């Protein structure tokens, strides 16, 4: 993602005027192959009316220009793209709040999972590795930057995420569906484990852990809606029809016709449109941004970041249930005390 | 569903126009029968004014031409289709996510439920065989690709979702209502039975299971919801006029009219009316996904996969709490130790 | 309610065209008062001015109803029908999440209540007689359809909801206000009275049953609020100005006028407005089915079905807990073993 | 407020036509004074054009006149009113259900504080009497209709919400903020309190206990929460100047003009414009709705009864865990039994 | 905030006409600098199209003026700006939300943390120190206003919400990351070496106070995601084009031509055109109400109070697990006891 949130804290004068001046991650970029395709096919449309056809060819073209212009407001632009736009928005914030995050569970297994020894050290490491690879497993299926991060299984092995023991007990386990609910069953079965040696003191503490696992097994399954659940494929393409085909006819509509011939309307000759050539840059504008965000985990510029977040929750995870068990501050006096 | 969640991860240039020359799941399948329709129709009376009438005649069809296409705008076709596809698209997403999944149940009775013989293992199979039965029994409620798959109870003894020992009790059991609930009936008296004979070990970890039964509970009281309690029929009703009548209206009000008259407006003959076929495209192409998506548990081409999901909870249910149950890897250090 | 759902599952061609043939809970039996007074009413306007006035006078409403043609579209009636649509409907289907069920309460004593005996039988029933009468008070207060069918507490007796010697107790509990809560009361009272005796085991099995107790408590919270927190009085008021001062314009504008006297826009006599009369049948559409689901607890077809799911939720309450306590049918290997 | 939802529970001829004669609670109470000051102001501009202007100066009028008709409509009006009026509704249901009630956290003080005598009944009334004070104490500074009742809190004291003795404890307390938090903690060391002398049982009771004060807790922070942050002020400032702008212009353009100048649209003079009447209806209705709404604990007539609500909490938490704490009912078979 | 909740509790006549004479928090300290450079813009071009420009070239400004004026209407600002200040506002109430509030902790660890000693009275003031500094560090992350008041980690150390011996364990603790996560680990750890010493009493009594914890860090995750994932800079680079591209061409547009060429339209000469300054007021209004919401953590006079509200709960916090633990008033018959 592109963040500007600080820079946008306070609203005096430029404050979105500023933001109009960045490549990354603007609607400059993203529609910059749509915008050339759209000039060379106006302007060659106006180069060959203006050199090209004869006398008695123009005002052929001169019929269908009024007849384009007039009768291209039945496309109804913007209902078909402003219901469109909504789904895409409705959809986008309700998959980062289904991005699984350790810290609930890394709160419980830091402090609950007893032991200073190399035991009861590994326990705690090999669970909340069993909670980041089984949100890794949902995310190399639902994001293409994740998947070409770890294409096979075998680099998910390299990266330290899963030891070369749990990958045979990975593929002997046969099922032909997704397997990302695995490791949160060996999570299970692991924390009765823990119990059962006496490391979870009392099953109040071991259900409670077991509460925070399912509410991370049902963030994954919201990931796993979202992805096999697409907005519906007969909505893209209409909308798709419908951006389109008004800027088909705004090709021959839009044109600068004879002020010679005294149409009402077309008393001007000013050989670039610029209110339509905005108006390609709101319709096909959000287009564009629907394009992009119809599908946040892929590798566009404001897709979301979610290679940086596997690095971020294996690293603070591993963090606070190995270097944070029982490292507490001295209890001291603060400043208010009597 | 057809999924294209994978080929928009990106937004290069023909992010959407790549997938405007898809078949299956399309506007173009939805349309085609309609469309023909609208097609024929409106060339029928082109060619009856343009070969049948006499003088005398086209000149009434010229006042009733112009008067529909005058008034036909009355008809508030946009507010009446767009208030209708917001309540279809707001039950579309909440039915999705009312459909239980068993992997809550399935990570606590993988682990609580103790026993490594042949007893505490059917006692595991039970359990999660009960959760998938409230499961199918509410979706041959509410789907009609499922009840072609199961048209009577004796087919889900035949899929091994019930043994015929729980086919005599479940007919012995008299209500005249939907008898959904006698699954999850029997799960919270096996569960119970279960704890008293030693392979639960504690109260609150049965009040764990039996809160993920609840929760599935709740998800089947939702799918039941759906189903009964329909969007108005007065809705259906008046969305299906104001599709219709409108059209009907731009079969006289479209044509083209004679240029030798000089009517406002009908200034050029085309003989093709490419944006009255694209109005139709769109204004009847959202009352036939409104058509679709009002009932997403039947059998179009992106409708929900209840018989594929089915066979998945099925499947992973009984291998989490069978093959799964102390299967655990081997603890080893992982690749980030000291 | 009426159910089509089952008839909409595809979408072939017919899909709601075979609906608009249904007479119950139709569009059609809604208008069918104000249509025909808005039919006559026109109609009477019209052979008076065709019939009555003389030819002085005919000009002056020749030129009220241009007037009134031409202003009547200041009245904006989208504007403020569609916003009291969207209220109406919000509060519809979260009005039916706020009706009460048994089957949370009625998983959990059935199986932690113990006693096979005829008191443990008599201690089950009393608690889910206490949860089913919790919701018969607050029906019979929010709903005219169950009032109609308990008029008197007396009637609730009669029925077998309450027995004799309840009725004395809720009687003498003296309160100026609405008594939905005393059988909430007396369920936690008796659910405590249970495990002070030993029926129920553990304080884990008897706080889960009273988790239960109080979320159909804010089930029937919730339905007070919506009958007591009315949709403002100011809003209906409006509303039913803005649709019927708009058709009392168009009683006098969208008269036929006088072909000879060749106004702009008045150049065909047809008798029939239809597509006026279609105009009226959506803008007061709208308006009648809001009337109908204002309150979606009341008398009309297309209303909540509340005497029916009280029958409902008695029956197969007091069948969970009475038939099917320890009543499990036979451990048995299903078809997927080895 | 106003309820009328046992008047719309069926949807006849009259439905809404009966309730545009009521007058509590009205749009005709409501906008009394706003039309009785633009009926006179649009009269007096009338009556000065037809009267005192002279002929070189009616003409004048007239150009003016003409301009801010046509040119009025630059103002959004129903773009920035129609987004006003959400947010002013989608904030007033959500301060009702931020209103706390006594009712959950009285069915389990009701029945797991213990005691019969003088002192399990004088403890389990200070537990309802501290939750009902944590619901006053942010109601009267929520709300202007409690604040009048309760000026100060000696006022709390003299209806019995307060002993005195409590009332020298709140004040001791020294903070300089809201202090709505202080019987919410006293409630929570009361109840433990209660535990370590023996009246409440285990310690899952106990948590139970308070887990629904805290659920109360965020109840209260919710009401602080739209008090403290409200709709912003920029935001009402500008819908206060595009209702009140449109209709000074309607004060010159919606004048009638001379017929005998034959102005296009001025061809007739009827003394009273009935549609820019109505259109101050709508317009100047809906400012006068979110006028009201926009603080739904004041005095208005359509505000919410919190005066009647705290007397309901008070009488019916103490009634229910001091009359009705062991007092069931017998036990008796009901009518279905064998 | 600027807050008036008090003042708009009733609405009587000038509700809302009494805050459009404030001057803080306003609409015109908002668009005090926009608005005088386009009047500034406007009367420059109207200064020298009536002064400079010779009479063969007004007549090209006028060609252009009404070219602008026609097609500007192309712009779609409504659309554009009408669907951004919806996402503002959807996330600027869900922002609020995620503030953490210390008083469901603050209830807990008043009551259940025992000892009146001055080791178990340092134990509940490091609890409720440890949960305000996990807010404070993410608030100085996404607030400008808290980052000025604590640049460095040394100005949180002189405030007293960190004691010198918990800095440089603060900063031992390496990571590359965001560090807020930390003292929500140290309560963690803390309240469990709390448990073992005796002084929280069960495990249950321990889950609550880890639940709760939970919920706090569930509300600072939701805070980091608002800060991190922004509205999309293609957004923001939208709307600030459709605003400032529609008000560029209503320089020329709307421009007073001179009434004795005789446009149709130009008829009258003001020179000031009131109805485009008001346009510019609420189109370039919703902009900058935009601008200020778009971050509610900055320093505007309508952001929100965090400055404030971090005072108000170590305050509240401190007071009442130190001087409010055991400290309750006497237990008293109140008002109504027989
Ligand atoms: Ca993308
Ligand atoms: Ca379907
Ligand atoms: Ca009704
Ligand atoms: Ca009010
Ligand atoms: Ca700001």
């Known amino acids: 993602t592109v963040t500007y949130t600080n820079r946008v804290a306070?609203?005096?004068?430029?404050?979105?005027s500023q933001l109009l001046l960045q490549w990354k991650g603007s609607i400059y970029k993203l529609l910059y192959s749509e915008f050339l395709i759209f000039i060379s096919l106006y302007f060659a449309i106006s180069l060959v009316?203006?050199?090209?056809?004869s006398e008695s060819q123009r005002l052929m073209f001169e019929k269908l220009a009024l007849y384009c212009n007039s009768?291209?407001?039945?496309?109804?632009?913007?209902?078909?793209?402003?219901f469109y736009v909504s789904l895409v928005v409705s959809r986008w914030w309700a998959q980062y709040e289904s991005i699984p995050w350790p810290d609930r569970i890394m709160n419980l297994v830091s402090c609950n999972v007893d032991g200073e020894d190399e035991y009861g050290r590994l326990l705690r490491r090999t669970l909340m590795r069993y909670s980041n690879l089984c949100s890794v497993l949902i995310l190399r299926s639902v994001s293409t930057a994740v998947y070409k991060r770890?294409?096979?299984?075998?680099?998910?092995?390299?990266?330290?995420?899963?030891?070369?023991e749990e990958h045979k007990k990975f593929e002997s386990l046969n099922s032909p569906h997704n397997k990302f609910w695995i490791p949160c069953v060996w999570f299970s079965n692991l924390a009765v484990k823990?119990?059962?040696?006496?490391?979870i003191r009392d099953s109040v503490l071991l259900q409670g852990i077991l509460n925070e696992l399912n509410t991370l097994r049902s963030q994954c399954g919201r990931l796993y809606g979202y992805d096999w659940i697409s907005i519906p494929l007969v909505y893209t393409q209409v909308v798709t029809v419908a951006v389109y085909s008004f800027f088909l006819a705004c090709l021959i509509g839009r044109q600068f016709l004879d002020?010679?011939?005294?149409?009402?309307?077309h008393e001007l000759d000013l050989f670039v449109p610029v209110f339509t050539f905005?108006?390609?840059f709101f319709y096909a504008?959000?287009?564009?941004?629907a394009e992009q965000l119809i599908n946040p985990f892929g590798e566009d510029d404001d897709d979301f970041e979610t290679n940086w977040l596997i690095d971020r929750n294996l690293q603070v995870s591993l963090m606070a249930v190995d270097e944070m068990h029982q490292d507490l501050p001295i209890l001291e006096k603060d400043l208010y005390w009597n």
Chains 1, 2, 3, 4, 5 share one sequence.
Not at 71 to 82: C, D, H, N, R, T
Not at 194 to 199: D, K, L, T, V, Y
Not at 259 to 265: I, N, R, W
């Open 150 to 164: 770890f294409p096979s299984m075998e680099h998910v092995v390299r990266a330290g995420l899963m030891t070369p």
């Open 10 to 16: 306070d609203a005096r004068l430029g404050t979105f």
């Open 285 to 289: 504008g959000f287009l564009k941004v």
């Open 278 to 280: 905005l108006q390609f």
């Open 71 to 82: 009768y291209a407001e039945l496309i109804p632009v913007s209902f078909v793209l402003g």
């Open 259 to 265: 002020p010679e011939k005294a149409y009402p309307g």
């Open 194 to 199: 823990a119990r059962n040696e006496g490391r």
């Open 49 to 53: 009316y203006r050199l090209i056809l």
